[PDB]
Amino acid sequence: MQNSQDFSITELSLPKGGGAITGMGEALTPTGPDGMAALSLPLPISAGRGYAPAFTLNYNSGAGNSPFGLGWDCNVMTIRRRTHF
Amino acid sequence: DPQCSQNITLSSDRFGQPLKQLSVQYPRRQQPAINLYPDTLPDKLLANSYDDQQRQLRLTYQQSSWHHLTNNTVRVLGLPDSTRSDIFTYGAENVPAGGLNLELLSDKNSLIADDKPREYLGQQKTAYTDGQNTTPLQTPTRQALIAFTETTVFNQSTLSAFNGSIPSDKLSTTLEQAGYQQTNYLFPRTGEDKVWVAHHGYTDYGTAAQFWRPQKQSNTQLTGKITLIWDANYCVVVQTRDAAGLTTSAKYDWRFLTPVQLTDINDNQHLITLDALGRPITLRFWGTENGKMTGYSSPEKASFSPPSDVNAAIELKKPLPVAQCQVYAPESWMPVLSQKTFNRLAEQDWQKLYNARIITEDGRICTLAYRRWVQSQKAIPQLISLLNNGPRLPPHSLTLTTDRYDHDPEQQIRQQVVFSDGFGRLLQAAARHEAGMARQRNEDGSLIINVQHTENRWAVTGRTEYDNKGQPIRTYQPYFLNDWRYVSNDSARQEKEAYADTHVYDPIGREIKVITAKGWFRRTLFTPWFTVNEDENDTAAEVKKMKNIDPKLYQKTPTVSVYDNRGLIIRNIDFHRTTANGDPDTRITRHQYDIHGHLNQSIDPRLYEAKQTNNTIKPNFLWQYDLTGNPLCTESIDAGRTVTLNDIEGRPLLTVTATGVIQTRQYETSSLPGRLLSVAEQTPEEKTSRITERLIWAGNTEAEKDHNLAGQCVRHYDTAGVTRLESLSLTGTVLSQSSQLLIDTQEANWTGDNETVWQNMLADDIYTTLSTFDATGALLTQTDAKGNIQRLAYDVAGQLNGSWLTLKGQTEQVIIKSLTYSAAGQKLREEHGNDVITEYSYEPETQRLIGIKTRRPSDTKVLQDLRYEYDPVGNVISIRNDAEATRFWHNQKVMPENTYTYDSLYQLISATGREMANIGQQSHQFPSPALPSDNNTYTNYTRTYTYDRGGNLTKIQHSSPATQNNYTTNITVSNRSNRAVLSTLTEDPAQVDALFDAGGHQNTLISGQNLNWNTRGELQQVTLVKRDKGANDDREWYRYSGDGRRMLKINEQQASNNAQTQRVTYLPNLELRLTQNSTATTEDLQVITVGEAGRAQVRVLHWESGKPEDIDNNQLRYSYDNLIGSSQLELDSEGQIISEEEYYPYGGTALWAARNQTEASYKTIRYSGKERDATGLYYYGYRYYQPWIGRWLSSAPAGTIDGLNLYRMVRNNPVTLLDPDGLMPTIA
Amino acid sequence: ADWLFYLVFDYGERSNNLKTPPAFSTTGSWLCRQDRFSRYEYGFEIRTRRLCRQVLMYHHLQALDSKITEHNGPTLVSRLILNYDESAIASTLVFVRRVGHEQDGNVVTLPPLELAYQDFSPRHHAHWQPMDVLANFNAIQRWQLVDLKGEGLPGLLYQDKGAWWYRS
Amino acid sequence: QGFDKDKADLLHVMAPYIAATLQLSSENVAHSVLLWADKLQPGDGAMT
């Protein structure tokens, strides 16, 4: 629609049920130049007010160990000292 | 010949934003010496694939800016401020060697350098607010609250699209009234003026003490604002309000933050129940209809516990106080442990299996853990049985939807099961139907093709196989199964009778080859410039292993779409022959696009060649658009030139038609929602715009809520009368509607504001219809305008399963005793109240009719028995009637079939059939039926049809050697337009346009009879007999509703001793026919119409006065319609024949006989479900059709027809096609 | 009391049984993993001795809804069950299930995501292969296995007197 | 057919046409190319 925006809240309409079964997905990633296998899984985090933390469990081959098991990561943003050298 | 394009960033900001960008569409290479094409293509294809529009270099230049609110404490980057988009066009010769790149473009003399032809396309600006002011801020706040968006709609040059037709001052004033404002360019150049813009998407924001939520919103400043009432935590909107005072609200399920209990603007509640994890489980709704509460019981009254197990959920009883109850079984794919297997493992082995994670904590078998134990030779054999004696079903869900409400004694439950894969795509769906034959599902999911009678039948449909990319590769045709459980795929594939198609995809994901159940296939070839599309006839030669049209006719006759370098279709070439061994011609439709990519013009190939010869010839169509693509003007050689202006809300304010009638629309003001209040118009001849329509809208009072009318149009005053809405259902449909028509001498000019006056414009015969609906919304009871009641019943699947009619003052008549439907839901069997059984046969591989049989079971007498033979596409090549000839045939028992021949464009070339030996010449004048006592015979005939390069039928050659009928119909076709008439009006093509008005409406029907079109393009009056200034003209005239329905037809004869007036009023479910002689009523007949015309409609003739002495009252007329809805066989209440009629392909009558003349006089629906008028003209909704010509009486409005010839009758294939209301909807 | 939504990570301090939802506020210790490990790249030992057993979401229904009493605390709305195939050598994630709980204690489950990893099984796979290709590769002569020129696999480098020889 | 050489300088007239059919000659290059050939007479007779 011309002369219309998508930031408009117009309905309180109820959702419909049935349809295809979804449940949980698997973000098996089509990685490129790194050649690594990777998979992301979502967490059941409610949007709440529309601002909510973003989390996923990331599987990354060769990542190392973790609180979520070998090869998995918590995906928490941090600042860290560089230990590389 | 590759296509090529390039996006170049010319400049960017310090924060990486694209300040300047260029999109380059490179021109096509010229013709190469070597083509490198597969040469499976028709000849003269590549030559006709090149066009000047493909050789253009298109440089779309976009300039923009942003705001960056940066400081030591704030960092908001990339907030849009503005953009401008210009386009340059250069020739192929201007492409630099090596193509374009940034270094060349940055050059001071580059193609996008200044002092170059920058054609403006448009610009936008974002206005920011602070939630306090209304005035746009110079810079945004940290919050980036957007006030509104500014879009340029008109350049000054685009106002030339008005083609004058408005004063210069009137136009600037009108644009301001419409909300357009004049402003400057955001990225101005030296040398330009202001442009017109629209402001939209307005938001008023709340504050920082709240979350900065929008509080009020509107599309434009010309309308009101909706108010968002936020909850305590500003998380969800709880209540909404609007300008009319109409509000809605909802309660939320705080576990999910989703609405569950909703209040409509009417006193109508909707409630859903959610489970853990948030899936809808149940739905109820309740509230009022007519001052009292009905619907489903609220949950505190009607307790309900949704079922768990899917089979348990199917085997339910009627009184379930719920709609759409869901049962989910996503777990069904997993193997589970039965109690026998577990109880054996329950001693020691289950523990090892449990620790191995084979046996889950919920007693299921883990897929991978099980496989690991099989691989490691640890698996316990007892578990093998759980993978085989209980085949898994794909994850699925069951819907249980009732027809009626909680208190109703009958509540059928529609049982719908859907299955899906693990990618979330449906595999199939099935629904419960009534008992009958069905395929069997074996214990292992194997499909048994051998059908058996059963109580439990599901119609399996949409069964689809996929390739793990979501590209369905196989569709199975629908069928009935004696189960609901999913049928195994490996089994179905080997049945073969379990018919299915095949979709072959390329690496892009496009379908290349589609093979149907019959082995016939479509094939598409793609090249960078054109797409070649072959149908099943085009490919027929390759699927040989001659009962149809010799496939040589369609060899190398693909449809080819030729594109420009912007991806737009500029040419559409058809190839064609009329003979199998001919040399196909090249019929090319041409299109051109403007700088915005909108279709600017289109040219018919007949007119194209004429146009090259004579450059004064116009394109068939020309369009002019505003900068956002809204057509402002359209001109059609077959429909005239119109100009339209809409306001900033998108609603039309002003339009002028081809004939110069200017129509304007009065809408509500900004304190109101902005709904239409009135339509007024004036012709060039008058000064005052007359109000032809007036809408009284409902508000938000209790009386309105009580009848579910809040916010509805409740009184619609239009051109024929006034329609009143008295009540709506809880489901949103009409329960009560009534109307009055205008006095014959009264024009619609609903002036003033006092309905007292408006009532005096009306006749006092007020018609009221009433309805009852179920919870779903199916019509259960329909009371017509005079009190006759139609009662309907539906089956477990929701389809009609019977029908009855109670006449006013009488007992209930059964109209339909029984109905059966195919898996596809097609009518399969029908048993009528007159003990006539209609049976349909469908080709199961194509799911289309292959025959129709009509019989009387009491004497096993077949009255009709048709067979339809089709070519590989679906054109009917033969229609055969294997029934015995009827009693109206004087010693003639055998009826040869109807042979059809089509050209490669599927136009008829020829057709054969039977006709009355004495039918004579086809004209607008219809012959009297033969009576069986006449001892008449029928003959065979053939017609041949000749068409021009524009698809106009130019000649029809009728031949019937038995009586030596030799009738040549000559059609004179305009040499400037596709307007055409018979040679009896004019022979000179240059005089043809003179016979049509500015809008393309024919002025003369037949020579001597004039046509009065009104301002809406509707036919107001037909002169039948032109007389002197003493005697009056015989004429017929009409009144139409606001949506263009013929509401009233008046047949006025002026014969001095026979000045009969037939007043025919069209009411829902009733044709009311009042016939008066020059002094008084001779007949007063109510024709009750049960069912749709063209769908074996049953009519009842009820007389209140003047019933013929040879007709009983309450006479029933059962129509048996053909493939496209034409009425061929008419039976009485005992199934005896009343009449028989055949038609020429275009609707002319070929054959007609009846039991009596009196009975014959009441048959009104004749062709393709439509009424044949007195003039021979057929009425189709928005159009009238001339069957003696094979053309429409008036052109379609531009834009409603996909092809270019606006007078063409149903693609020149009236054998298989029909066009409801005369305006075949766009495929778009 | 200050927040509407909570995302809680369970390290073994609360029940993960399908029969009942866990409380927001619980007591009891968390549970150590078998695959315990340390890291030293920051100059000190950092040691991980636990892993997340489940993840669960809670809503403060009293602040969100109306008519809520007793302030029992946040109520879960959804949780993930993380089962690990745990050994001292390695602990891997093998099962992820999303479940919810009904207000009457019933449990709603979705089909779980099952994962599998390769195994190291030298006790079954120890396949001896003679090698003729390493002719004369003598540990006590001037021979070594080295990658030269950036190649990923080592070749056979022989350092003679006056020349080097190499088999890539 | 379009341009009359005595109203429009034929070199200016033809430079855009040879520009399009030759390998992207700009109008000044195409003009110069035509002029070269007119001065040269590269043919059997006074081919200009």
UniProtKB/TrEMBL annotation, chain A:
It comes from the Bacteria. It is found in: Secreted. This is TcdB2. It comes from Photorhabdus luminescens (Xenorhabdus luminescens). The chain holds residues 1 to 85 of 1474 of the full protein.
Automatic annotation (TrEMBL), chain B:
Coiled coil: none annotated. It comes from the Bacteria. This is TccC3. It comes from Photorhabdus luminescens. The gene is TccC3.
From TrEMBL, chain D:
The gene is tcdA. It comes from Photorhabdus luminescens (Xenorhabdus luminescens). The chain holds residues 679 to 726 of 2516 of the full protein. It comes from the Bacteria. This is TcdA1.
